[PDB]
């Protein structure tokens, strides 16, 4: 009933930042 | 009963800045 | 009831961050 | 009673980061 | 090179339509 | 190289329309 | 090389209209 | 060379329609 | 050299449809 | 050496269907 | 040289289709 | 060297398509 | 009645990490 | 009667990272 | 009345990782 | 009694990690 969805991403660029690929394709469908 | 959805991206800055590739397609429908 | 969906990724760069691939293709149908 | 899923991924790049693949293809369906 | 991804669903009602659940949780992730 | 995605949905309510539940979570990250 | 994404819902009306439940979460992200 | 995916679902409801569930959980990575 | 994956489902009701559940859980992970 | 998967499922309900479950669970790694 | 995986199931009802459960679980690994 | 794997299952009932549970578990490691 | 499925994978490389291929093709099906 | 499903992957590097191929292709159909 | 499904794999490299072929084709229907 | 499945595998290398072949074909079938 209580949808508790928590997405936490940690990126500690202590050396040299760049660019990682993160795709959040979290999709939920329910009959109305 | 609420939909408590939390999305957090913690990016640390210590080196040469650039840019991440994040795509948010999180969706829901009832 | 609570639908506890916790997704957590820890990426720690201590040398030279580049870019990994994290594809969260998590879905549901009712 | 209810779904309780938790995905925890640890990536400690102490040397030199690169690019690993993490495919989370989780899909569940139910008839209402 | 063409990535041909065809998704076709044919629902034909001749009596009394209601509501079927079709969930396309198709995704992909690639290193760049 | 040339992404050709064709999503064609056919719904011919010749009797009595209502409400089908279609969920499209098609997403790709590169 | 273009992303030709075609999405179409053909709903025929011959009975009593109501309303479908469609969730369009189609997307994507690449290095730009 | 390239990917060729074809998903064709036929649902001919001559009588009374209801609610069938089609779960397309397809995920590929590289 | 093309990955040809075709999935076809033929559901034909001539009396009274209900709730057939089909789950297509297909995935794959690679590195080339 | 490209994978050629073809799945064909025929469901002919001359009387009336209730609830059948077809599970396709296929995964490969390279 | 290719891989031909053809899965075909025939389900014909002439009175009352209750519904069966057909689970197709196939997996393959390889280093290329 | 082409691999041919074709699974054909028949299930026709002229009375009551009860149905049972069939498990096709096939795994190949290279 | 209370499903407790847990997958724990350890990848400790203290030299030159390459990356193993882990295919978690876990599927489940049941008639409702 | 809770469905407790936890997946934990511990990837530790102390020299040089590369690219692991982790595929969590899990699916359930009811 | 708990269903215990514990899968644990330990991979430790003290020289030079290469990457094993770990395929967990776990299929379970009821 | 309630299903108790436990799969433990150890892969240690102190010289040069290799691509060990591990295939777990688990097949579970039971009536509901």
Curated annotation (Swiss-Prot), chains B, C, F, H, J, L, N, O:
Proteolytically processed under normal cellular conditions. Cleavage either by alpha-secretase, beta-secretase or theta-secretase leads to generation and extracellular release of soluble APP peptides, S-APP-alpha and S-APP-beta, and the retention of corresponding membrane-anchored C-terminal fragments, C80, C83 and C99. Subsequent processing of C80 and C83 by gamma-secretase yields P3 peptides. This is the major secretory pathway and is non-amyloidogenic. It comes from the Eukaryota. Induction: Increased levels during neuronal differentiation. Expressed in the brain and in cerebrospinal fluid (at protein level). Expressed in all fetal tissues examined with highest levels in brain, kidney, heart and spleen. Weak expression in liver. In adult brain, highest expression found in the frontal lobe of the cortex and in the anterior perisylvian cortex-opercular gyri. Moderate expression in the cerebellar cortex, the posterior perisylvian cortex-opercular gyri and the temporal associated cortex. Weak expression found in the striate, extra-striate and motor cortices. Expressed in cerebrospinal fluid, and plasma. Changing residue 25 to L: Reduced lipid peroxidation inhibition. Zn(2+) 2 binds at residues 3-4. It is found in: Cell membrane; Membrane; Perikaryon; Cell projection, Growth cone. Cu(2+) 2 binds at residues 3-4. The record marks 25 as: Susceptible to oxidation. Residues 14-30 are annotated as: Interaction with PSEN1. The record marks 6-7, 9-10 as: Cleavage. The record marks 23 as: Implicated in free radical propagation. Belongs to the APP family. Functions as a cell surface receptor and performs physiological functions on the surface of neurons relevant to neurite growth, neuronal adhesion and axonogenesis. Interaction between APP molecules on neighboring cells promotes synaptogenesis. Involved in cell mobility and transcription regulation through protein-protein interactions. Can promote transcription activation through binding to APBB1-KAT5 and inhibits Notch signaling through interaction with Numb. Couples to apoptosis-inducing pathways such as those mediated by G(o) and JIP. Inhibits G(o) alpha ATPase activity. It is linked to Alzheimer disease 1: A form of Alzheimer disease, a neurodegenerative disorder characterized by progressive dementia, loss of cognitive abilities, and deposition of fibrillar amyloid proteins as intraneuronal neurofibrillary tangles, extracellular amyloid plaques and vascular amyloid deposits. The major constituents of these plaques are neurotoxic amyloid-beta protein 40 and amyloid-beta protein 42, that are produced by the proteolysis of the transmembrane APP protein. Cerebral amyloid angiopathy, APP-related: A hereditary localized amyloidosis due to amyloid-beta A4 peptide(s) deposition in the cerebral vessels. The principal clinical characteristics are recurrent cerebral and cerebellar hemorrhages, recurrent strokes, cerebral ischemia, cerebral infarction, and progressive mental deterioration. Patients develop cerebral hemorrhage because of the severe cerebral amyloid angiopathy. Parenchymal amyloid deposits are rare and largely in the form of pre-amyloid lesions or diffuse plaque-like structures. Binds, via its C-terminus, to the PID domain of several cytoplasmic proteins, including APBB family members, the APBA family, MAPK8IP1, SHC1 and, NUMB and DAB1. Binding to DAB1 inhibits its serine phosphorylation. Interacts (via NPXY motif) with DAB2 (via PID domain); the interaction is impaired by tyrosine phosphorylation of the NPXY motif. Also interacts with GPCR-like protein BPP, APPBP1, IB1, KNS2 (via its TPR domains), APPBP2 (via BaSS) and DDB1. In vitro, it binds MAPT via the MT-binding domains. Associates with microtubules in the presence of ATP and in a kinesin-dependent manner. Chelation of metal ions, notably copper, iron and zinc, can induce histidine-bridging between amyloid-beta molecules resulting in amyloid-beta-metal aggregates. The affinity for copper is much higher than for other transient metals and is increased under acidic conditions. Extracellular zinc-binding increases binding of heparin to APP and inhibits collagen-binding. The transmembrane helix undergoes a conformation change and unravels partially when bound to PSEN1, facilitating cleavage by PSEN1. This is Amyloid-beta precursor protein. It comes from Homo sapiens. The gene is APP.
């Amino acid at each position: 009933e209580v949808h508790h969805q928590k997405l936490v991403f940690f990126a500690e660029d202590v050396g040299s930042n760049k660019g990682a690929i993160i795709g959040l394709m979290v999709g939920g469908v329910v009959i109305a």
